[PDB]
Coordinates of C-alpha atoms in Angstrom, one line a residue:
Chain W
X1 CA -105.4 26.9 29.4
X2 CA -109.1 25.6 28.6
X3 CA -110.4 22.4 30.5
X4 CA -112.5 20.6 27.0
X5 CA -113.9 16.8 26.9
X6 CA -111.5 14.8 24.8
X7 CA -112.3 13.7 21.3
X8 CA -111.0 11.2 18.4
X9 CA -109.1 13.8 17.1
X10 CA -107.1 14.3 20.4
X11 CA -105.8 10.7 20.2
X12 CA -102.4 10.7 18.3
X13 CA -101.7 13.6 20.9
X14 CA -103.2 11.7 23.7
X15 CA -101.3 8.5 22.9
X16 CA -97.7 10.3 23.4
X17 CA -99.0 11.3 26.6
X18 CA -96.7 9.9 30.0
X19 CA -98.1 9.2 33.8
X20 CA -94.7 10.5 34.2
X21 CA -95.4 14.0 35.7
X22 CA -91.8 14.1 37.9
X23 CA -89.3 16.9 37.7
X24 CA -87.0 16.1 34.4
X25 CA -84.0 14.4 35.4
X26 CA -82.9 11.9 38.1
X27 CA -85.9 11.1 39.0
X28 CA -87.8 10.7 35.9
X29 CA -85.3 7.6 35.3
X30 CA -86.7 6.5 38.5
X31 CA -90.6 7.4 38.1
X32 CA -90.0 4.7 35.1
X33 CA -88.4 2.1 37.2
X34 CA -91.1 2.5 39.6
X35 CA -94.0 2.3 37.3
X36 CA -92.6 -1.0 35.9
X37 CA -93.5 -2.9 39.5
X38 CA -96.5 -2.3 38.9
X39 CA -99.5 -2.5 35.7
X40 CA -101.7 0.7 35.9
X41 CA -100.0 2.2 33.0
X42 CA -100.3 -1.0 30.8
X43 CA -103.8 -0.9 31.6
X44 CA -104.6 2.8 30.8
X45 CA -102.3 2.5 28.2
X46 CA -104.8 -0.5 26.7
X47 CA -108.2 1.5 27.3
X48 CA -107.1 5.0 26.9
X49 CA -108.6 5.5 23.4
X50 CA -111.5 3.2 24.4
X51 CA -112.1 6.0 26.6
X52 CA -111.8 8.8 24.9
X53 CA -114.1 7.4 21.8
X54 CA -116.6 7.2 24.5
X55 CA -116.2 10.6 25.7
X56 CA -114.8 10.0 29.1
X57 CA -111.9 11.7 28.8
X58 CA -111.0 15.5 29.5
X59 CA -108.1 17.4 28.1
X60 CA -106.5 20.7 29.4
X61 CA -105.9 22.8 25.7
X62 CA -103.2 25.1 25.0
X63 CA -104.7 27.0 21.7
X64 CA -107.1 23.8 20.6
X65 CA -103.8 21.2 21.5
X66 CA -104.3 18.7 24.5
X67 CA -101.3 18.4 26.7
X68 CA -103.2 16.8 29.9
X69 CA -105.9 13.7 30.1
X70 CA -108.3 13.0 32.8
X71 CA -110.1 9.8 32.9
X72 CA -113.4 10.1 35.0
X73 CA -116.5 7.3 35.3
X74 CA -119.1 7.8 37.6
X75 CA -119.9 4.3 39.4
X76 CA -122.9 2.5 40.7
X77 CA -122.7 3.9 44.4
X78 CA -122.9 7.1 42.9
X79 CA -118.8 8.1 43.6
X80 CA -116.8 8.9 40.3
X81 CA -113.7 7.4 39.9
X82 CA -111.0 9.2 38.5
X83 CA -107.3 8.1 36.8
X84 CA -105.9 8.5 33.5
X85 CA -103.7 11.3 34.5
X86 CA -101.1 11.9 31.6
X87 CA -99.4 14.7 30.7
X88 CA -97.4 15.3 27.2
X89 CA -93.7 14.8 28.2
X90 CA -92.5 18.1 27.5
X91 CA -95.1 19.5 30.4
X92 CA -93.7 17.1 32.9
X93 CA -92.6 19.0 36.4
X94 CA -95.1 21.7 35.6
X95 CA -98.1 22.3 37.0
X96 CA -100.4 20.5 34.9
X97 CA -101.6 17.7 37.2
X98 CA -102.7 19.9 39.9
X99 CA -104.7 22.3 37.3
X100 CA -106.4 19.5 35.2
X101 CA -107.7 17.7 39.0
X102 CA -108.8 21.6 40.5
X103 CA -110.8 22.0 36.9
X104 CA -111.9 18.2 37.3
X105 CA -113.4 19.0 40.9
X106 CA -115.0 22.1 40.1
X107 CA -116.6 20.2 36.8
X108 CA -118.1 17.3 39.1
X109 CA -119.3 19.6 41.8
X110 CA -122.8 18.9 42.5
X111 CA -122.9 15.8 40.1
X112 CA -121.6 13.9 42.8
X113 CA -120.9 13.3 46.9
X114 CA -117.5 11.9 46.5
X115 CA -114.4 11.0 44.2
X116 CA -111.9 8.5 44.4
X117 CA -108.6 8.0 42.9
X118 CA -105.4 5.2 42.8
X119 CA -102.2 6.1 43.1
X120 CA -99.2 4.1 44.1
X121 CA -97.4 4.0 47.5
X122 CA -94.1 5.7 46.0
X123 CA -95.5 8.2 44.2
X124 CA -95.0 11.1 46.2
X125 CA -95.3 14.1 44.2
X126 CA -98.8 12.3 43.1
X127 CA -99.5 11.6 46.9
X128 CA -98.7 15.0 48.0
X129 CA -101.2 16.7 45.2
X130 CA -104.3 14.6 46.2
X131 CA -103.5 15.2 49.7
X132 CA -103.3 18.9 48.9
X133 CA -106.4 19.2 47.5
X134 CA -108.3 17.4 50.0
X135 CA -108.2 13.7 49.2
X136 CA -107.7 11.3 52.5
X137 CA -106.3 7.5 51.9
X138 CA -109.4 4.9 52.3
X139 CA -108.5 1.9 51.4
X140 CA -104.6 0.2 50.3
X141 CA -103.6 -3.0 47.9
X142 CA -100.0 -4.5 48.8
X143 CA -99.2 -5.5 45.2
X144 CA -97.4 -8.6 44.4
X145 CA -95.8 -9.8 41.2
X146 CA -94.9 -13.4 40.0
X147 CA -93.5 -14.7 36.9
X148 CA -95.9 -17.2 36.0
X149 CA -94.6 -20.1 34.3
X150 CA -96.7 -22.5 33.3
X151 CA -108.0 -22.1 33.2
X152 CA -108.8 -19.3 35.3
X153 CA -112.5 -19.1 34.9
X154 CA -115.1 -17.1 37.0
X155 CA -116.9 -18.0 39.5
X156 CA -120.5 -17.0 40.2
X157 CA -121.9 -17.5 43.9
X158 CA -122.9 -15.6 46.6
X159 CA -120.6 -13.2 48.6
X160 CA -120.8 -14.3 52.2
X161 CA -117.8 -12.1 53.5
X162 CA -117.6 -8.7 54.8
X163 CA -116.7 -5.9 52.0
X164 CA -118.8 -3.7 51.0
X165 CA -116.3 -1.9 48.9
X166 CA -113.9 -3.4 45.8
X167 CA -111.6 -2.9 43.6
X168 CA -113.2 -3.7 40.4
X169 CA -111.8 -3.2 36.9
X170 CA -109.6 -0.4 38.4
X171 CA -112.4 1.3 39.9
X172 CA -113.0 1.4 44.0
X173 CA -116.8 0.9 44.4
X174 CA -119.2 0.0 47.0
X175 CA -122.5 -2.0 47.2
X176 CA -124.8 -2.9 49.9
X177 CA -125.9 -5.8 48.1
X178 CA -123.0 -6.7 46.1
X179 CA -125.0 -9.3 44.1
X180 CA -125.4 -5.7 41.3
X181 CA -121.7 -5.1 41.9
X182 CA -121.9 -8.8 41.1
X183 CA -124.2 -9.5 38.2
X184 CA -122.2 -6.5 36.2
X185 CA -118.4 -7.7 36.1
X186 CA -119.9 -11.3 36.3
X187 CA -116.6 -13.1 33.6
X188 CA -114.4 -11.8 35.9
X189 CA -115.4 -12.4 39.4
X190 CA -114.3 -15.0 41.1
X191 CA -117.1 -14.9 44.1
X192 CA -117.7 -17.7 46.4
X193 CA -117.7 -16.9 50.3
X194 CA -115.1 -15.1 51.5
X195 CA -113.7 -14.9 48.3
X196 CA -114.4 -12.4 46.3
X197 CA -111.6 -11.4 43.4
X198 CA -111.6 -9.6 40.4
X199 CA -109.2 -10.5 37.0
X200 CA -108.7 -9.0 34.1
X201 CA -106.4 -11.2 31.5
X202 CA -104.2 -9.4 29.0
X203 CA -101.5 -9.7 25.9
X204 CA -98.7 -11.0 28.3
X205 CA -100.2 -11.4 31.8
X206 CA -102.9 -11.5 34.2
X207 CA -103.8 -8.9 37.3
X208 CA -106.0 -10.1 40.1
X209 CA -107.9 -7.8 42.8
X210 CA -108.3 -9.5 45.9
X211 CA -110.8 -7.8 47.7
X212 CA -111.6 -10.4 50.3
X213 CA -110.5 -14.2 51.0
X214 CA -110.7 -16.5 54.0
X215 CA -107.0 -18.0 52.9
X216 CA -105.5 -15.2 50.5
X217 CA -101.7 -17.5 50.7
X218 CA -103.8 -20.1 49.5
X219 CA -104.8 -17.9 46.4
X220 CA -101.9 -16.7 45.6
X221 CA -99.9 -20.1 45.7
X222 CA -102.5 -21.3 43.7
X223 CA -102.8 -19.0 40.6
X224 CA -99.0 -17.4 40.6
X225 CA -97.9 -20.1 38.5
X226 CA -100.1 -18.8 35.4
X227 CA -98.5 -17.9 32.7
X228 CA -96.8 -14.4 32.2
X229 CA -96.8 -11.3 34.6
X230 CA -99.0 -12.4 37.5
X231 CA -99.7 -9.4 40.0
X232 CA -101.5 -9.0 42.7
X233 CA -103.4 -6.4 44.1
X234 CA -104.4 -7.9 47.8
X235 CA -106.2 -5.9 50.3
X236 CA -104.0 -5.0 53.4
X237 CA -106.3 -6.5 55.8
X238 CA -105.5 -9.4 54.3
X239 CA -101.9 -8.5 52.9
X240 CA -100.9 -8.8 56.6
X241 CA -101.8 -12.8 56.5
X242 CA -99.2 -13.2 53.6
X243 CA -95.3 -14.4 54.0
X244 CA -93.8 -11.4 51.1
X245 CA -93.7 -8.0 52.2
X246 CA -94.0 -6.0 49.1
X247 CA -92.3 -2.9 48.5
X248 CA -95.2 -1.0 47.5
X249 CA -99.1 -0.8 47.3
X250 CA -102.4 0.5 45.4
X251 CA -103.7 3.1 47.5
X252 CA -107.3 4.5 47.4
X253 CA -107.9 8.3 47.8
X254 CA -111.2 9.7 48.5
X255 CA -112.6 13.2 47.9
X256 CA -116.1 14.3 49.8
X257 CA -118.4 17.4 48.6
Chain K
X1 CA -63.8 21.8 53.8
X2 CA -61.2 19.2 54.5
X3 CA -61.0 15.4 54.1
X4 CA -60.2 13.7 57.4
X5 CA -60.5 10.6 58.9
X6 CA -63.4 10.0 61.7
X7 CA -62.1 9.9 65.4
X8 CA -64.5 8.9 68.2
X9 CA -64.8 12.8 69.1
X10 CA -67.4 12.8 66.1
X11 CA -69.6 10.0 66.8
X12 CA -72.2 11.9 68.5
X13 CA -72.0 14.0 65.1
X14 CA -71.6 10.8 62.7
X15 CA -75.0 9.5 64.5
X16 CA -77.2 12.3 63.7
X17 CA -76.0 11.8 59.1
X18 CA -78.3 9.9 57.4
X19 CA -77.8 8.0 53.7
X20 CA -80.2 10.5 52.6
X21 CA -79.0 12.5 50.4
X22 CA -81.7 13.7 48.0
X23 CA -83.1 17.1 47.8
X24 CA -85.5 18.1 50.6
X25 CA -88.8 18.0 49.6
X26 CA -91.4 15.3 48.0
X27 CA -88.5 13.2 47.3
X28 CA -86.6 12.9 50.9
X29 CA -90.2 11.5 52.0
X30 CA -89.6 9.2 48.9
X31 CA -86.5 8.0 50.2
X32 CA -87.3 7.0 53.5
X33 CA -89.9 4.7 52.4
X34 CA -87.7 3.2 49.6
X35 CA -84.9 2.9 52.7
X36 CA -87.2 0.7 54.3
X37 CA -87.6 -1.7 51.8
X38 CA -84.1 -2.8 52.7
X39 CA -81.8 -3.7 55.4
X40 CA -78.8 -1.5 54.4
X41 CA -79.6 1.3 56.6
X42 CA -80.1 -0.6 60.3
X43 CA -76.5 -2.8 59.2
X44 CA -75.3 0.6 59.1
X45 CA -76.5 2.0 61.7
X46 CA -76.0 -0.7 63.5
X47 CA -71.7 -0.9 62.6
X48 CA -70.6 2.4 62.0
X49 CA -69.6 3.7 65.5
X50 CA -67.7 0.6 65.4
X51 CA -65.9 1.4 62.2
X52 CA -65.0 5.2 63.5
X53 CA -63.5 3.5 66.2
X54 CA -61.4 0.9 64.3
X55 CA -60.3 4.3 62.3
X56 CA -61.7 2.6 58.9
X57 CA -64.0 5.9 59.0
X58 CA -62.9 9.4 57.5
X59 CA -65.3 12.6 57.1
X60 CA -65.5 15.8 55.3
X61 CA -64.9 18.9 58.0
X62 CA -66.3 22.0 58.2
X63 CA -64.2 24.5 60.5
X64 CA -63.3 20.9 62.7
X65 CA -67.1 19.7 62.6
X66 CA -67.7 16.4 60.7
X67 CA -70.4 17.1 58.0
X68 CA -70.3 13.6 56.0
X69 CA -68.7 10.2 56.5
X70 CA -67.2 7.5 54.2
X71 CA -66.3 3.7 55.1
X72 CA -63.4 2.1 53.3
X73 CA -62.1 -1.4 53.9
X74 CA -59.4 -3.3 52.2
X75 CA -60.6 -6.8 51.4
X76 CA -58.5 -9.6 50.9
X77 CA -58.4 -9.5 46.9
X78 CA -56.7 -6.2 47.4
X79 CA -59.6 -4.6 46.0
X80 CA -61.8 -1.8 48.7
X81 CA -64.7 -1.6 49.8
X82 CA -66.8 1.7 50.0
X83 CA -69.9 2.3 52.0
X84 CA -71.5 4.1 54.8
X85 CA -72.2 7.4 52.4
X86 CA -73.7 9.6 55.1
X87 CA -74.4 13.2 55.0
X88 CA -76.0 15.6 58.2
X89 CA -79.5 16.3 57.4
X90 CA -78.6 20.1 56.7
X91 CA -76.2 19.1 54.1
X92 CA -79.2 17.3 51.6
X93 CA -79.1 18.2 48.3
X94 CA -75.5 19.3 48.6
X95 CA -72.9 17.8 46.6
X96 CA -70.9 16.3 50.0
X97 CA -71.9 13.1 48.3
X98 CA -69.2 13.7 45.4
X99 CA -67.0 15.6 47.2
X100 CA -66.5 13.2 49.6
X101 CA -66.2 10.6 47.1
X102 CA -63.7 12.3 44.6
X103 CA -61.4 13.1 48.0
X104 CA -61.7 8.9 48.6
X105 CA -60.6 7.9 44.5
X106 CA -57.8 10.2 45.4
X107 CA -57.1 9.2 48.5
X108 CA -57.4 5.4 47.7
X109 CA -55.0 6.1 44.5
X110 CA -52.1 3.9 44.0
X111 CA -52.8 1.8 47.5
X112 CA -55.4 -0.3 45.6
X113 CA -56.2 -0.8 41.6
X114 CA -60.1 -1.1 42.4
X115 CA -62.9 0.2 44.2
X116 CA -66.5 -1.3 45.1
X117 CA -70.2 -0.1 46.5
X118 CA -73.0 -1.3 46.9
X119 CA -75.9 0.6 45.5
X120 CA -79.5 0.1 45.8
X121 CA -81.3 -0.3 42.1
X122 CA -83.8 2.8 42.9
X123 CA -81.3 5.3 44.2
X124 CA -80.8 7.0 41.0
X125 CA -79.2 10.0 42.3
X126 CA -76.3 7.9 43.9
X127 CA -76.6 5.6 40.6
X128 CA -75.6 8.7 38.9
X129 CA -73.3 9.7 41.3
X130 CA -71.2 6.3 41.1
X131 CA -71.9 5.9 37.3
X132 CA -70.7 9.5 36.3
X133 CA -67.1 8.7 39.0
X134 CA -66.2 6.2 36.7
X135 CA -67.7 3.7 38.1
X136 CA -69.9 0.5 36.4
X137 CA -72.1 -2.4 37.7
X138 CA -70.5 -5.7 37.8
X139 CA -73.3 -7.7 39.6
X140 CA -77.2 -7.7 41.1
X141 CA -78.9 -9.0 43.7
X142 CA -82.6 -9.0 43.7
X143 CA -84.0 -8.5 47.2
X144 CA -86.4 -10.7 48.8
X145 CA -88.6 -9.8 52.3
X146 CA -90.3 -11.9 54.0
X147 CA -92.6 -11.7 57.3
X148 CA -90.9 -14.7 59.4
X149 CA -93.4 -16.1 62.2
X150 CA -92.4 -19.2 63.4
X151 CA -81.9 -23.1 64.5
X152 CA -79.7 -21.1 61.6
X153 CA -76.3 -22.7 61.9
X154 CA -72.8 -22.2 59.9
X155 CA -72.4 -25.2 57.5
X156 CA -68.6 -25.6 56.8
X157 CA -68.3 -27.9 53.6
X158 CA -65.9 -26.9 50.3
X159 CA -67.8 -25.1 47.3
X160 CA -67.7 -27.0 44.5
X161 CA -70.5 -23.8 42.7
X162 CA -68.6 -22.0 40.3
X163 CA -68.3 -18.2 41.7
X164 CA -65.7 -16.5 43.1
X165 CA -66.9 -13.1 43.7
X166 CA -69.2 -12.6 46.6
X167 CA -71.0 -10.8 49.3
X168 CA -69.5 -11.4 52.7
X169 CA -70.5 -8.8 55.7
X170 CA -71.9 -6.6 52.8
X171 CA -68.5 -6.3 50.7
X172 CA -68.3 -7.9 47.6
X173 CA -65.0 -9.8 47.4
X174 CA -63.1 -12.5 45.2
X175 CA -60.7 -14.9 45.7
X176 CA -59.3 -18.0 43.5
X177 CA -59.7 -20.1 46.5
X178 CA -62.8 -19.4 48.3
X179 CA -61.7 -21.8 51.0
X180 CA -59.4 -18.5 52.3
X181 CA -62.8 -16.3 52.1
X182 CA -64.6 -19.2 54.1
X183 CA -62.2 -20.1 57.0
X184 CA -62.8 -16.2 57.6
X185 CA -66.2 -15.9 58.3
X186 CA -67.1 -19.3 59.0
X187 CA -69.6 -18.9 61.9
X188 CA -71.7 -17.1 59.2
X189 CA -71.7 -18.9 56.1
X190 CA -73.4 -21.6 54.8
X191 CA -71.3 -23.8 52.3
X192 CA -71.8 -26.8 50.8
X193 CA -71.2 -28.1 46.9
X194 CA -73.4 -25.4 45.2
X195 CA -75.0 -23.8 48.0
X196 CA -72.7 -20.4 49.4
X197 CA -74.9 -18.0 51.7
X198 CA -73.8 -15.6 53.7
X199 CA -76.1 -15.0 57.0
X200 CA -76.4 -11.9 59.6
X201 CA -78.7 -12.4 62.3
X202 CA -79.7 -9.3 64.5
X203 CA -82.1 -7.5 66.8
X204 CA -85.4 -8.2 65.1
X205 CA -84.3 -10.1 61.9
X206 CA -82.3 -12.1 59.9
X207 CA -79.9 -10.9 56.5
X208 CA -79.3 -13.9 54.1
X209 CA -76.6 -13.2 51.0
X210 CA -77.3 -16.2 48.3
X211 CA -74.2 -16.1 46.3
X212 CA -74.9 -19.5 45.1
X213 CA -77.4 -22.7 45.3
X214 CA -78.5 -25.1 43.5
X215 CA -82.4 -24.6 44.0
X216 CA -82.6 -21.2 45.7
X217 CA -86.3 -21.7 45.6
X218 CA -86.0 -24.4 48.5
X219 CA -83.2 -22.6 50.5
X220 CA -85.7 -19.7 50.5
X221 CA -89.1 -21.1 51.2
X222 CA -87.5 -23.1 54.5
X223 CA -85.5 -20.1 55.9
X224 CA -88.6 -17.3 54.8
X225 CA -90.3 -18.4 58.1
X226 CA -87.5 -17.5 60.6
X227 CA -88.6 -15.1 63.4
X228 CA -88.2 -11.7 62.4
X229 CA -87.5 -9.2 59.3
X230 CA -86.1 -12.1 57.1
X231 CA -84.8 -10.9 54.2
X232 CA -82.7 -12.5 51.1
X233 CA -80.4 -10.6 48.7
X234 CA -79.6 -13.4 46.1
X235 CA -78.0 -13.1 43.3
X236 CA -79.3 -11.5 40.0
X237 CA -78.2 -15.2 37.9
X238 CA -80.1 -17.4 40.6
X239 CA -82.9 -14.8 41.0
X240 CA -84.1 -15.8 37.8
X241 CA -85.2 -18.8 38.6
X242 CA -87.4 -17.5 41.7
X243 CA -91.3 -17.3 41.4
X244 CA -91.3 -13.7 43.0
X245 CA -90.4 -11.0 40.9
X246 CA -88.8 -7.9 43.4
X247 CA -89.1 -4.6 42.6
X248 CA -86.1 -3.5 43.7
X249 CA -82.2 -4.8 44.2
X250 CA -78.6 -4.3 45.8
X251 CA -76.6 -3.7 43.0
X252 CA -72.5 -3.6 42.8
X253 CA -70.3 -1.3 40.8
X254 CA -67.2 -0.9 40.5
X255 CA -64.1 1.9 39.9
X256 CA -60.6 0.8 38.1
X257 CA -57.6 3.1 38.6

């Protein structure tokens, strides 16, 4: 097993390739049940080969064919951010997660202070494995889903509030002036006070980061009614202000050097 | 072992079994935090030394010791009602959970021509368990949980909705005339023309079963704020029309002999 940057010709391997890395059986059923309250795999699933083309993807190889994808992007606060993690189905219950994130660590060792990762509240076996190797839980993201049913813009001020670290197309970075932070995602910030959110519109829905708000149930009410799947991802800080308790969260892992 | 009912000498036993049946490991941790993302578990635990007392409770022994329980109740369609699936924390894994339920279809044989449970969407193992007995779903109800911050009252009116099956003190039950079902538990139900909710306040919250409503939408938003857990298990047909999408459900299936 050889640890090898991704390439085009990896992709129609790549693209069969499952998040799914539970024991085969009962609880695959239920890894996919899970996975659907939630839109990390749509996303990665919708970038994935805009990745790899721009070599940001590693592969573990057995005898020149990929079976394992690590996504990795080093940010502006000079953390890289890691997802992606997909394994070929027939690999699932092996080992293959925890090798391609040991190869992954060794590979950013002195290019960087610190790694981050997301991985949902259910996910256990995924939970236990970053744990495992070191990882400790920084920040969560109760995640809340609408059906939208029947204009959202962004929204470029000055960020009067409080954070210093966001979620930000899927990445967890931090800024002590988050005007740069700001000025980069700018057509899909919603920044203005307290608030401070980040969207990303797709085929079929929407997903919104709220980082910070002074009236997040005010948010919510406002823009659930969009149209399509409209989720959610609200900092608990602010989660604990809202009327729903969700069943599950977006939790940020963090790796030091 | 041996199939036997439940006498009050096991109860200090029959407190210690959980619902947890799943092998020990990542996936008992996995449970837990999918148990608390419903209200089965403290109903439960809050009835069943009730139920071993009433004799409506019978166990699987080992050398006299109680190792698993099983609740049955004989509703007033004729049909019964199974729940309480509990196991001692030794026993995980096992295959008690069958055993004990193959001893009940035999057991129940010829004294009634069907069989209900109530199993949560994400419990795939006991989805499995039920599914592979013979069993199949008949109805869903979406759960709904709320964080109540801030005067509930039985409404006794006829039903002019259009169901006859429903879910009264967590057994789902029929009958041509709901006004026999009503007169029954008619200090917990609200009734009137569409609307048919069943209500369980406790210690620390409040259960609401929507069977039926004309706008479930309204009946939730003005109960949501009770004090307490608040939580709503409403049926899979009106669910549809809610602006919250849950991630998980109390689902119903159902054995014919």
């Amino acid at each position: 097993i050889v640890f090898d940057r991704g390439s085009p010709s990896d992709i129609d391997e790549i693209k069969t390739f499952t998040s799914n890395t539970w024991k085969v059986g009962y609880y695959t059923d239920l890894y996919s049940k899970l996975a659907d309250t939630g839109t990390m795999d749509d996303y990665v699933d919708k970038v994935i080969e805009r990745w790899v083309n721009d070599g940001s993807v590693y592969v573990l190889r057995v005898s020149g064919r990929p079976v394992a994808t690590i996504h990795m992007e080093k940010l502006p606060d000079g953390s890289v951010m890691l997802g992606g993690l997909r394994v070929h189905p027939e690999y699932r219950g092996s080992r293959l997660g925890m090798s391609i994130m040991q190869e992954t660590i060794q590979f950013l060792r002195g290019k960087t202070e610190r790694l981050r990762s997301a991985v949902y509240s259910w996910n256990e076996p995924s939970l236990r494995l970053v744990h495992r190797l070191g990882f400790h839980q920084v920040e969560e993201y109760p995640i809340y889903t609408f059906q939208g049913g029947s204009a959202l813009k962004p929204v470029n001020e000055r960020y009067a509030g409080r954070w210093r670290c966001f979620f930000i197309d899927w990445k967890y970075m931090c800024s002590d002036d988050p005007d740069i932070i700001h000025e980069e995602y700018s057509n899909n910030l919603i920044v203005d006070g307290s608030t401070f959110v980040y969207f990303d519109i797709y085929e079929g829905g929407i997903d919104l980061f709220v980082n910070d708000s002074d009236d997040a149930s005010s948010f919510i009410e406002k823009y659930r009614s969009m149209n399509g799947r409209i989720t959610f991802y609200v900092r608990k800080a602010l989660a604990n202000g809202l009327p729903y308790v969700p069943a599950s969260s977006l939790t940020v892992w963090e790796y030091r050097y």
